[PDB]
Structure formats: C-alpha cells, structure tokens
C-alpha cells in the first residue's frame, strides 16, 4: 500500500517553500526564553525533593512528557551540587523559534522576552535577522540582544532529565519509551507582560511583520503578591494581540500550546485569549487531551490518552473539535510518525499549499534531529535524506480505514493527503524520523514554527 511518490512530494515542496520564504516581512516571537540544563541519565508542583522524585516516577511508568514547575531557588542549589548537568542549550518556546527562524534567513525576526539577562543574550544567534525591541527616547529601537538588555535581570534556568530505552531501577518498573522531565523555574519577578512604551509601539511592530508566534502563557499564576489576578495578565495577553492587529489587519497570529498543570489557567488561556483573537494553534497528542479536558470533552480526551487502536481516530476528532470550539482557522497537531492539520474553509491558503508547509516542517524537523541545530536555509535540505517512517504510514492506516468506511473522504483523497469535508479540511502526512537523533528538545516548536512561516510565505495576501 506504501507508494514511493511521497519522496517526490517532499523534494518539490522544499524548493517551492524556500523560494517563497523571502515573501515574509517579519515575525514577532515573544514571552518565552530560558537556559536549559540537560541532565543525562498526586503532586502538582515541586517544593521539596520528595516531590521531584515522585514526579520522575510518573514519567518512568508512562513515558509521558510531563512539565512541572518550581517557584523557589531552594532546589536550584540542591541539584546544582548533588547532580551536575552536562549541557546547557537555548530553551523556551519563543527562544528556540527565534533562533530557528533567524537561522533560516527569515527577514525581520523580532524576539521579545521580559526577563532578558546578561547570560541569556549570549544564547541568541548574532545576525541582522534577529533583533530585540527596546523603546528608548519614545521611539521604536530594534537593537541586538547582545546589547539592549537590562543588567538587573538574572537568568532563568530549567532542569531537564531525559532518558530512553527505559533503563530500570527498582526502589523499595521499566520506562516504556523515551521520555524527558522538565523542572521549570518560575520566580516571582518574571511576568508575561511588556513595558507600557513597547505596548504603545505594537502597531509599528505589526506593520513591519506578517505573523506573530506567541507562547508562554503558562507562567500566569492565579494569585500574585501585588494583588493582581490571572485575568489581568489574560486581559493584557489579549490587548497585546489586539494592538498588533491595529497596525496590520491581515496579520496572522499563532499560539504554540504547551502542557499546563493548572486547568483553570489552561481553560482561561484556551477560552479567553485563544478562542477568537487567535487563528493558529500548535499541539501534540497529549495537549489535545489537555485542551479537551477543559472545554468539556473528557470522554474523547481519555480516548486520546488511551492506548487502543482507535486512539488516533480520537485524536482526529479531538483536532476537529478544537478547530470549531475555539474559533480557529488552523490546528496543527504533531505526532511521532505523522502530522494532522485541520483547517477552516476561510483559510487564506489552499489545501494544496497547506500540504507543502507540513512537508517542509517535516523536512525541518528531520534536519533538526541530525544536525545539532540548523545554521542556514540550505541546512534544511539535508532533512530530505531521512526515510519516511513506515510506522507513521501504518498509524495512518487505522485512521484511513476509519475515514473511508465512515464516508468522509475518498481512498484517493487519503493517499494524497487532502480531505475536504463539508465544514472543514484536513491535511495528513507521514513524517521523517531519525533512528539516532542528536537532540530532541525543540523539535516540536520547530515543526509548528516552520509550518506557520511557510504559510505566511505562500499567502496570497501580498
Ligand atoms: N527523531 C525525530 N525525527 C523527526 N521528528 C521527530 C523526532 N522526534 C520527535 N519528532 C517530533 O517531535 C515532536 C515532539 O514535540 P513536543 O511538542 O511534544 O516537544 P517540545 O515542546 O519539547 S519542542 C513529535 O511529535 C515528533 O513529530
Ligand atoms: O514553560 P517553561 O518553563 O518556559 O519551559 C518551556 C520548555 O519548552 C522548551 O522550549 C522545549 O520545547 C524547553 O526549553 C522548556 O523546558
Ligand atoms: Mg510542544
């Protein structure tokens, strides 16, 4: 059943997208930057080490990627001496995406972070593509991160413990698949916010860009020390989105969702700031269930997190509901062997061009695995040598047999990757997976970011 024509679709997509990546004016990427600390190997937050080991055991028996936060530096000095990290890389949704797009030659990459530190600026690439906004003397100044940063700000470091093959140790029992645990520092001084002056010059920033990639809203707490609610930061998160559209009407705005422990913050994010002011959303199989658990579809959410064969068809239905419940124009869910992107019929980009974006995003993710990171637009070309994962092609077979028997799409339509339903459209591709990747943090942000910028390029709104 496996047709070798898919290798031809990847090749003709890379050249067509790379030749269009000059059509984008700029991108605005904001709110998430930290320094990862990779360590080589029911509690809701980490206050004492007994909680850290407990949350590690959950990841050791499910193989699920769980992100849990710490608020005090009481355990920063705990691990830093008891357990030495071996590598420190650029981390955060906005940070990785800022480096990726700059390394791709995307023009006018505008990266903003509230906590910009002296140690943090050294991790950003040095190029005319990547610039940070500082509003000094009442006017908009886009200066390099190396220089326009605040000295009083101290860095934000996160601990990442990753492991594979499930090397087991019994205490007083083997990890199924590869899994990583993220211990994120959320000190009281970091806030998802921006200066009042930079909040004023947002129409200027929007007029010189074509898209915005926003992520990091999980830093918002319910209660603050200065007596401010999560609704204010939720309100400000929208008004920043609003003022960007006031300088550009045709700007598309993407939000890269992430695992959020607090369901009340998770729901307030999906309902108050993503529902109507956002067009694009990026997810993974586990976050779709997370999104359903707050919108009111837990039966389907449990079906997504379940292990049966019909879990993928639940992931399909989960993506469709997220596209309609949230009034979204695009939903990009990325899995290990395949991508699933459901798109509205209002989409300013045809389903034919939606496929090339996913094929390109799949080409970028493979090169991201082989090379430590990507340094040029031509480096992505290396990603075409990774073979298409047959496991991903066979996972779609369970979904294909379910869709052609339901009567939604044609057998021809699925083998090509373009399904046209009466109210929405779906694009499905098998991705390219490396047996021995070099680094596996950031691959997710890279898929949605590379796919999102490829859409703005091929947009006829130019
Ligand atoms: N070897 C390899 N080769 C190609 N592509 C890969 C590979 N490994 C993973 N992937 C992708 O990473 C995604 C996880 O991103 P996720 O959002 O879950 O993680 P982060 O938020 O840390 S970037 C997963 O859905 C896969 O499509
Ligand atoms: O929510 P936080 O603490 O910024 O962590 C975001 C995580 O996402 C990553 O960018 C991986 O996608 C890591 O660098 C980081 O651990
Ligand atoms: Mg992710």
Author numbering: 1 to 41, 65 to 195, 199 to 488
What text appears in the publication on this structure?
Nonetheless, in some archaea from the phylum Euryarchaeota, a modified version of this pathway has been described, where glucose and fructose-6-phosphate (F6P) are phosphorylated by homologous enzymes that use ADP instead of ATP as phosphoryl donor. These ADP-dependent sugar kinases can be specific for glucose (ADP-glucokinase [ADP-GK]), fructose-6P (ADP-phosphofructokinase [ADP-PFK]), or bifunctional able to use both substrates (ADP-PFK/GK).
Here, we report the crystallographic structure of an ancestral ADP-PFK in ternary complex with F6P and Mg-ADPβS, being the first structure of an enzyme from the ADP-dependent family with F6P at its active site. However, 28 residues from the small domain cannot be solved in this structure; 24 of them belong to helices α2 and α3 and 4 from a β-turn located between β-sheets β9 and β10. Analysis of residues involved in sugar binding shows that F6P is mainly stabilized by hydrogen bond interactions. The phosphate group makes contacts with N32, N34, E90, N181, K179, and Q244. Despite the relatively low resolution of the structure, four water molecules around the Mg2+ ion were located, assuming its classical octahedral coordination geometry, which is in agreement with the electronic density of that region. These polar interactions include residues located close to F6P (R212-Q244 and E90-T284), and others such as arginine residues, far away from this sugar (R67-Q287 and R112-G397).
